[PDB]
Subunit: 341 residues, 4 copies
Amino acid sequence: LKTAYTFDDVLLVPNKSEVLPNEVSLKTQLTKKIQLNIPLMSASMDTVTESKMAIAMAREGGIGIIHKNMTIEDQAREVDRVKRSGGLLCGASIGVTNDMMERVDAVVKAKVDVIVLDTAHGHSKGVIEGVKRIKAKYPELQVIAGNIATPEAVRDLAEAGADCVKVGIGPGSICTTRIVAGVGVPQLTAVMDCAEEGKKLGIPVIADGGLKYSGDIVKALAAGACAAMMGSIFAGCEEAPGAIEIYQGRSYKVYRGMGSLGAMAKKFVPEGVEGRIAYKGHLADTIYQLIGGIKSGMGYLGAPTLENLYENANFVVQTSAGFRESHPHDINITKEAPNYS
Amino acid sequence: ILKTAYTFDDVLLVPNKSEVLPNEVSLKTQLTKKIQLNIPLMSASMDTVTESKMAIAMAREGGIGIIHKNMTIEDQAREVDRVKRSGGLLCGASIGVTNDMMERVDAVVKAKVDVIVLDTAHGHSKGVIEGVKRIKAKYPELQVIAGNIATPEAVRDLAEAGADCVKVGIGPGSICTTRIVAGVGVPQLTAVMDCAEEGKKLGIPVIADGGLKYSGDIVKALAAGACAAMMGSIFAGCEEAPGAIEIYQGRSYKVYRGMGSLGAMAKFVPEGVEGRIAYKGHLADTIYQLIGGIKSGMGYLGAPTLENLYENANFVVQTSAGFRESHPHDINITKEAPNYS
Amino acid sequence: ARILKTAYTFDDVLLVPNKSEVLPNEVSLKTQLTKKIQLNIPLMSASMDTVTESKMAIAMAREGGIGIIHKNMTIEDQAREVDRVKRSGGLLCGASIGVTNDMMERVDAVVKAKVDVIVLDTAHGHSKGVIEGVKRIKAKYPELQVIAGNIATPEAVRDLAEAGADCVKVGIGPGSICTTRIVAGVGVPQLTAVMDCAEEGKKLGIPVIADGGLKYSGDIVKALAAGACAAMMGSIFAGCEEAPGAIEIYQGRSYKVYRGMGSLGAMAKFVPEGVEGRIAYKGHLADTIYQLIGGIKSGMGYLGAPTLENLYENANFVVQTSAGFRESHPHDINITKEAPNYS
Amino acid sequence: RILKTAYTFDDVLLVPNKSEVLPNEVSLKTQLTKKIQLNIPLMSASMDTVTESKMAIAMAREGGIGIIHKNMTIEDQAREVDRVKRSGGLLCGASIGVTNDMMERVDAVVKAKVDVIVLDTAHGHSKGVIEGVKRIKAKYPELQVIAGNIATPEAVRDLAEAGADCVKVGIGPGSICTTRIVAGVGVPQLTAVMDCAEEGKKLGIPVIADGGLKYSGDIVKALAAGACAAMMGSIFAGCEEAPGAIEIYQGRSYKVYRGMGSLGAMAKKFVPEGVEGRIAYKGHLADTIYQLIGGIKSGMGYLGAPTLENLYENANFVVQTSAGFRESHPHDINITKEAPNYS
Ligand SMILES: C=C(C)c1cccc(C(C)(C)NC(=O)Nc2ccc(Cl)c(OCC(=O)O)c2)c1
Ligand SMILES: C=C(C)c1cccc(C(C)(C)NC(=O)Nc2ccc(Cl)c(OCC(=O)O)c2)c1
Ligand SMILES: C=C(C)c1cccc(C(C)(C)NC(=O)Nc2ccc(Cl)c(OCC(=O)O)c2)c1
Ligand SMILES: C=C(C)c1cccc(C(C)(C)NC(=O)Nc2ccc(Cl)c(OCC(=O)O)c2)c1
Ligand SMILES: O=c1[nH]cnc2c1ncn2[C@@H]1O[C@H](COP(=O)(O)O)[C@@H](O)[C@H]1O
Ligand SMILES: O=c1[nH]cnc2c1ncn2[C@@H]1O[C@H](COP(=O)(O)O)[C@@H](O)[C@H]1O
Ligand SMILES: O=c1[nH]cnc2c1ncn2[C@@H]1O[C@H](COP(=O)(O)O)[C@@H](O)[C@H]1O
Ligand SMILES: O=c1[nH]cnc2c1ncn2[C@@H]1O[C@H](COP(=O)(O)O)[C@@H](O)[C@H]1O
């Protein structure tokens, strides 16, 4: 049995640097045809991304994926609100269902830029045939297929015609897939394995779920992922759907998995939980902290571009004792940091 | 030092290419060569888990229950008979290595029990080996499960005495202090694996008994090669289990104790503890969650049958960091999930 | 590379079951503390002033074990304590001795009091002082049984065996009240230390004592399977009524004071190597001993061992991770009744 | 792409050695360079909550050295240096950053007779630091230059070639540090020290083990790894001589402590790499040093090491697990008394 690692298992080693954090470029190719100015995407979840999130993401240089837990017409409307807010980029998740192409037609007429054929188990007959049929009707349409965790999945989805694949089985902060079904692979080893296959095929991969800190994004990108998708980092922002609740003098936002009971009900066996996270203000202040943390990581590693970061990044594995050293330790913190807990 | 040994929380199953949905998979399993179950679940023989009402309900769901032996021989026969009357359902019976062993066996077979479980603390022992041979001598066709053991040597030796099936588990029990008190045991996932591996070479099933907390654990135990999975904790809060409801801060709990605890054996030197657990309601509802979870994991792994799940399962070890990613994290869960906590 | 050996303590490992022809009540817990000194059970009470004086050493001896009277008292007082134990039936008794100018005056007085065995006990047993101490004790008192410690390496076992040690005490820093690893950065995880010292002890024919870091009876079984001839405990015995010290009330419960011999309080410009605290009152020693003995016999039955020696020759260990540890203790239950061997 | 498992201090223990020397026999003497001898191998961190003139004077009088922090006007820091230089020719240091005004800061601490500058930066393996050392050594050939912070042998070899007299190792281990969280970058501090020390020995360059030390034992491990000295902020920030307000929380008095990369420090937007907090007030620096020195002498005593060079040459390391980590700290006891060297 081989050991697989997540982000908190590894640290990136400093390289010689001639660049400073404000000198590096975060541009990335989400697909051959879609370039993003920062490597960040908001999750296609009903407590993270609707048109208001998708607009602010796009203005920051990333992209949002409008969730599909709504009627076909309303999702087309959401996409429409983004595209009419100054020609920004927009995505939209699609499902393996009988009405699948009826939903695609709608958001395609609303000029969506990318579709995410998004399922619990992406390495499947449904998703492979779905990609083919979507490409049959819309050959120009950019397709992201997921979710997967193995290089074999990258191959089979690349052959179905996906323009991009999304890596992540069970890392999500609100996910119980690993509890309920016992299936997953630790996210850093997942992205590393699939990214290396992605680059042999010329197909990019997205690191999706399990990211908590800007440093976790740096590890994902250094592992070969074109981009990072978050729910929990963005769920607490004002632009995410759902009002703020105040509890014990602090303010929180509802955040829940799309396999949770609340989400699915808009019996069954959930693969996600429903809870609340701390309110973080506007999306612009979160994005800034993440971007700054990413540029800081790339500086330590001497990388002026994302591709140079990936070709020169060395990881080391840290134990549970290294873990404690790598977070603030042996101190009573009195003031919360803007980029730490 | 032999080697490192893993339990359920140490490992994850790797997704496979899949052409089958969770609702397409079959859960049928051979408990012995003569006894098929529609689903691979067993309720433990404990005085707070399985009497006739629980073995009736387990049987209705396609499983089986083992009526505990902490009662007179007469009452145990009644309980079996109470089960068989209710539509010819399948029933099991716990026998111990005692003086009245044949007397107890005599009565449970008169009530037409389908399988007996000759189980002791240390099943790899002259007592059990000789016990099996003696039972099989007087009742050759009667199905006999022997346990508990944790080594392939034990599997081979129990097989050569005549056991129709062997039960794996020394110390994983949620109420168990054997490993604390005696320092003895094998992490349950490594034991089932090494034991199933030997057991399959001999044509003898092994049962994963003890230590199961969630449905994903059952999937791990079956991917490892168990023909079935035996639970105490998961069933012991259900309506059909014996024991009084106590209310603590407006919530309903239910007694659950080890058979080697003080209360059960009633100086003594116990090897279990005694306590309370959240009342879960009807068994059928708990079984529904566990069953959904198993079908979900088998769909993730492309396996339409348990045997195909065993042949194509790939485990990866996760660190304690992988472990924190593999549970909901960085959220205050506000709603209760039917399959998590 | 300087870092290649991983070392394990008791919670890292589990004993694998063996085929068994023995039941728990059939096993023999007898063991040779030294060639001259047999014990009926392999338990010793620590030479600490919150653990062992005459009252604790008397009670340990009646149960088949032995206590070591601590040396934080005047020479005359330690000899009275020894005499007290020895006068009450000829029970076994040990006593502690340090590397000091008056070392032999202390050894004289406990020998006049009929002590069966002395422990030349220092923080660093693998030292010129302790090596020459044994030599000088054996020259004045050749028949005197001498345990030397504490140590943690096979080289330590050999050198002290060659000084005259009849038995070697192993444990650098596993103590529940010990800060040696904290303060100095020095130690060996206790199960690997015992394994490695026992193995060298066996080649030379000198027994070794697993000293410190035992919590539950299962740990003692691992100590014995690893080769130790006997096991020494402060924490497990310190709550008992026979342990010296006051009853403090905290959160409405009764505790008894327990502290390192290297702590500030025990030593009364000090740099201590242990702390001072309280553990919950356990009642009398007979209860605690009884559960320990019950647990050791249980594990020997799981391993088919009728003697401590047979347990050592046939014990296989398996390493468990921090997730295995979680499974190896009770889990997912609000325990509602007090267990006599688990808290 | 995973190179190796890397270790920090709590991952390891030093194995005892045969010893002919007691703790009060060992020498703690060391040197930053041949020109900068220290009676003990300890330096207080250059942080605005750790080392101004008061702390440098007292560090100097205990045989260590203080690095006056640079979060102040060039004039003020030279004044602070001049203040410790006049208190009996005590040794002094001063931290310099890679800024536009950096040569005038060097000029001004040089005129004040400072003994060593620390060109201190977030990422020391950089063209900026490399060029900085060259510029400093070209104008002041005799000035002792420490350069950091770094974590790799390659960085050692580069800074050595720039002209650095001493290299400072530590990316991420700081108690107040979030670099590893926000940027994902760092190297567990024991492996970093060990690899950088070994590269520094091939080149004749000494390395300083900076950050992540919590107990006196951690320092022993760093010196045995080959560091010539150890730098600490958390351990000294609680002392009376440290700058910083006293806060009170549940019966204890605290001192403010914060990373130089936190929000408060940088305010003399921002993406911080450190946090702002508080540390238990410890009283006078003399008592903290006494416990640190005594703990270090204790560990060298255990390793049979009469000097730091002998400590480094004979130190064997062993890896403990999380289970072993729980054994290496006081366990299973309600600790009722403060220990002067353990909290
Ligand atoms: C993000 C997740 C996980 C998720 C989101 C919304 C719902 C679910 C529910 C329904 C709970 N779970 C499943 O569908 N689980 C499942 C598991 C295995 C297979 Cl092969 C499968 O194949 C159908 C498909 O791929 O749609 C499905 C889960
Ligand atoms: C499920 C467990 C663990 C259990 C259930 C009810 C009682 C016990 C008690 C009595 C506490 N414990 C033992 O019997 N323990 C033991 C230990 C070793 C041997 Cl070989 C042995 O062999 C005799 C027998 O098999 O009765 C027994 C335990
Ligand atoms: C049980 C322990 C640990 C202990 C008990 C009472 C006192 C101490 C104090 C004094 C705190 N600590 C020491 O003596 N520590 C020390 C450390 C290294 C050496 Cl080599 C040494 O060599 C003299 C000797 O071997 O006594 C001594 C500790
Ligand atoms: C000791 C730490 C951690 C630290 C101290 C004061 C400030 C900082 C702030 C500003 C938060 N962080 C940075 O400057 N971070 C950074 C990261 C990469 C590079 Cl290449 C870089 O190049 C300038 C330099 O190395 O001076 C800088 C951090
Ligand atoms: O309920 C669910 N079960 C499993 N995964 C989910 C569920 N809902 C969302 N996800 C995934 O989890 C990701 C968010 O993870 P987070 O950034 O760690 O909070 C999403 O982008 C999806 O890939
Ligand atoms: O007190 C006991 N000591 C040790 N094992 C026990 C005891 N009582 C029940 N068991 C075992 O533990 C299993 C239940 O474990 P659970 O499913 O984790 O709650 C049973 O099926 C027995 O194999
Ligand atoms: O203060 C001390 N520092 C380090 N070890 C000590 C100290 N006092 C007692 N010991 C050791 O710790 C053992 C007790 O460990 P315990 O059984 O884990 O509580 C004693 O037998 C001594 O070997
Ligand atoms: O804010 C910062 N971010 C990261 N490291 C810092 C910061 N400020 C100081 N340091 C480092 O942390 C060390 C002190 O760590 P400590 O001794 O664990 O408290 C200093 O000597 C610096 O090397």
